[PDB]
């Protein structure tokens, strides 16, 4: 639907938007750090379903943090449940934030990447859980589909891939405040299916204010 003309320009645009938004919670929130806890906590309820002991238990070795920000999801949610965590984001200067905000317990932060995800290839066989939250909004309907494919090819055995976005209720927003596409769910299971994923289980993330956009998880691999 003419989403992007000339899609450098979306990622420049979007590249330099983040550049010039401070490392904090709030910042990587757009303003509303004060749902972190919220969403930490639900984040940590959908991830007990594959952690806790089943068929197929998801590993508790490695994980990746994509978007990752000054490390807010891979603080609170990952870094407790997972020995060595991986973080991959393209403004440098969230992961320098990252090493204070983290601190002690950012030692066990095994890699900082710093790179777009449309270019981002992650080493094969490394993580168990790849944590997608709030990023996908930056990336073209093509570039989405090909990085889920190369996520795919990173899992470990039993590994899954998470995706928490926003989900519009009908039609495709354009917010250019950021430079982001907002997608209806049809279209995300649509670019999920066209990269060789299975759905496991699909969650909406409730006690958020109505004014953001709904929020959904879903559960890959
Ligand atoms: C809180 C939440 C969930 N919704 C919200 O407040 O929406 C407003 C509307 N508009 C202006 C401010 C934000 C973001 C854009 C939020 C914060 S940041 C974010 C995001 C989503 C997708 C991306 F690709 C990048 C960031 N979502
Ligand atoms: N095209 C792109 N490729 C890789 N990262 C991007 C990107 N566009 C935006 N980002 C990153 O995604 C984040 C947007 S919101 C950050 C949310 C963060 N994952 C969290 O813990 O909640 C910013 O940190 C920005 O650096």
């Given at each position: ?140 309907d093509?570039?989405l589909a090909?990085?889920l ?34 997608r209806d769910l049809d279209v995300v299971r649509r670019i999920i299916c066209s990269a060789?994923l299975?759905l ?22």
């Amino acid at each position: 639907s003419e989403v992007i003309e000339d899609e450098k320009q979306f990622y420049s645009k979007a590249k330099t938007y983040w550049k010039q938004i401070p490392p904090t919670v709030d910042g990587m929130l757009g303003g509303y750090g004060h749902i972190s806890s919220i969403d930490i906590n639900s984040s940590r309820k959908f991830l007990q379903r594959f952690l806790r002991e089943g068929p197929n238990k998801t590993g508790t070795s490695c994980a990746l943090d994509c978007g990752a920000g000054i490390g807010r999801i891979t603080k609170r949610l990952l870094l407790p449940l997972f020995r060595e965590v991986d973080m991959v984001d393209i403004t440098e200067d969230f992961l320098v934030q990252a090493k204070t905000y983290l601190g002690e317990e950012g030692k066990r932060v095994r890699n900082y990447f710093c790179c777009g995800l449309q270019d981002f290839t992650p080493e094969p066989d490394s993580y168990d859980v790849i944590w997608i939250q709030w990023v996908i909004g930056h990336l073209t309907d093509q570039h989405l589909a090909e990085f889920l494919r190369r996520c795919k090819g990173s899992l470990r055995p039993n590994g899954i891939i998470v995706i928490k976005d926003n989900m519009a209720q009908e039609g495709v927003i354009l917010d250019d405040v950021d430079s982001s596409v907002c997608r209806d769910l049809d279209v995300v299971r649509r670019i999920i299916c066209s990269a060789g994923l299975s759905l496991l289980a699909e969650e909406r993330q409730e006690n958020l204010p109505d004014e953001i956009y709904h929020v959904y998880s879903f559960a890959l691999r």
